[PDB]
Ligand SMILES: [Cl-]
């Protein structure tokens with residue numbers, strides 16, 4: 261098959277988060293867009309594309325209100341386990357000389373381990389996230405509050421089209437099975453808006 265990095269696993273924690281529908285209060289769980297932003301914050305170069313395949317929602321979904329009434333609903337006390345990998349960016353063949361698997365996998369590993377190359381945000385400039393590396397064994401065994409049930413989380417924003425033409429948004433039916441949410445390719449999203 262085409263080049264694919266090893267699977268990487270990251271744990272993301274935050275006291276507060278705000279995951280929104282930018283093509284319209286927080287969704288109850290991260291969107292693919294939000295997770296993409298988190299993982300890219302750990303390490304990204306246009307040579308490669310980070311591909312988020314699954315997230316585990318570890319803690320009970322809780323929100324809290326902030327604002328005035330004559331309004332902002334944030335998630336509270338969140339923990340996500342993210343499974344992802346990278347592939348070479350087909351849209352940047354001009355960077356083909358930098359497609360060095362050992363180099364990028366080493367940097368990714370180091371980057372997750374140190375908590376990311378950049379500050380990690382969970383939806384606002386005040387919602388900081390904390391990233392650390394977990395093993396596949398840990399990804400598989402850390403208990404989720406939602407283990408035992410499967411829950412329809414409804415239609416959620418997936419991502420914007422990429423990469424002139426009007427901006428298209430993709431949305432997806434979102435099911436959380438024993439705390440785990442898988443992310444389908446943009447091309448499989450049932451709902452598209454321009
Ligand atoms: Cl390839």
Ligand SMILES: [Cl-]
Pocket residue numbers: 431432433448449450451
């Ligand atoms: Cl869908």
